[PDB]
Amino acid sequence: ADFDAVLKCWGPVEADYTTIGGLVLTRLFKEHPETQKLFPKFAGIAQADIAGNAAVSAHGATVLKKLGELLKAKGSHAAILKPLANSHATKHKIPINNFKLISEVLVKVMQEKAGLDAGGQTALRNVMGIIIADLEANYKELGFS
Ligand code: HEM
């Protein structure tokens, strides 16, 4: 049910993953400035210059596309999410807490831009909690605790 609740508001997100993606990463770097150093391609860009940066928006689209693919998948999740844990722990070196930060940014962006109401916000927090718990478990399998 919670996946369906999010999907009832996903139209404006998938309509323009680049614009919405840029809003998400811009807001992440604004509100949680310590996250910006986790993207070496973007670390050091003055905050005022992020909203208009096309590469930031393209990278925001990547996360939103993958979340959409996690919402619409008819086969194994687990198979979509294990590779994500692997790359984020071993290649990108992203501490787990950062996933909670980006999830809360997305909740707020969807409230503002995608009509996600109180119940939908709870549903999205539940979905993101499922995802984050799986990432955390897979991180631990790799030795990250
Ligand atoms: C559930 C949340 C997230 C999803 C679905 C997601 C998804 C992705 C995907 C699909 C890629 C490209 C393929 C790969 O390398 O695995 C990627 C790359 C990356 N992600 Fe994430 N990500 C998430 C959260 C984060 C967070 C919280 C950060 C840092 C705050 C982060 C930082 C990165 C970086 C640095 C890359 C590499 C970008 C590049 O190659 O320039 N991701 N992510």
Side-chain angles (χ1 to χ4, degrees):
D2 288 339
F3 291 81
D4 288 335
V6 181
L7 283 168
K8 292 171 185 180
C9 294
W10 197 250
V13 181
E14 191 156 350
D16 192 351
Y17 281 139
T18 296
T19 299
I20 303 299
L23 298 170
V24 170
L25 293 180
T26 298
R27 185 161 185 171
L28 181 70
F29 299 154
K30 175 65 187 177
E31 296 186 354
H32 305 285
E34 75 283 15
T35 65
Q36 197 178 335
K37 65 172 180 311
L38 300 173
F39 301 78
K41 297 167 177 180
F42 307 139
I45 298 174
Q47 183 63 40
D49 302 321
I50 299 177
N53 186 292
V56 173
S57 298
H59 280 82
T62 297
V63 50
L64 299 180
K65 285 177 175 181
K66 181 61 59 174
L67 291 175
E69 168 190 5
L70 285 160
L71 289 168
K72 302 181 189 172
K74 295 75 39 107
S76 173
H77 287 185
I80 295 164
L81 288 172
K82 288 186 170 189
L84 189 69
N86 290 157
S87 64
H88 287 65
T90 75
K91 296 182 176 180
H92 314 322
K93 316 321 229 266
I94 308 307
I96 288 291
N97 182 245
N98 297 107
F99 294 95
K100 305 172 188 182
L101 302 180
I102 201 174
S103 298
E104 288 293 318
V105 171
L106 179 61
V107 173
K108 294 162 207 34
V109 173
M110 288 192 71
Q111 182 190 27
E112 287 175 4
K113 301 298 166 191
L116 192 73
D117 76 0
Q121 293 154 31
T122 298
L124 179 56
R125 287 187 176 109
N126 290 347
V127 168
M128 296 310 295
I130 292 169
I131 290 169
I132 294 165
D134 192 65
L135 289 167
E136 184 165 347
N138 287 321
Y139 269 44
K140 182 156 59 58
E141 292 189 7
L142 290 160
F144 297 91
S145 286

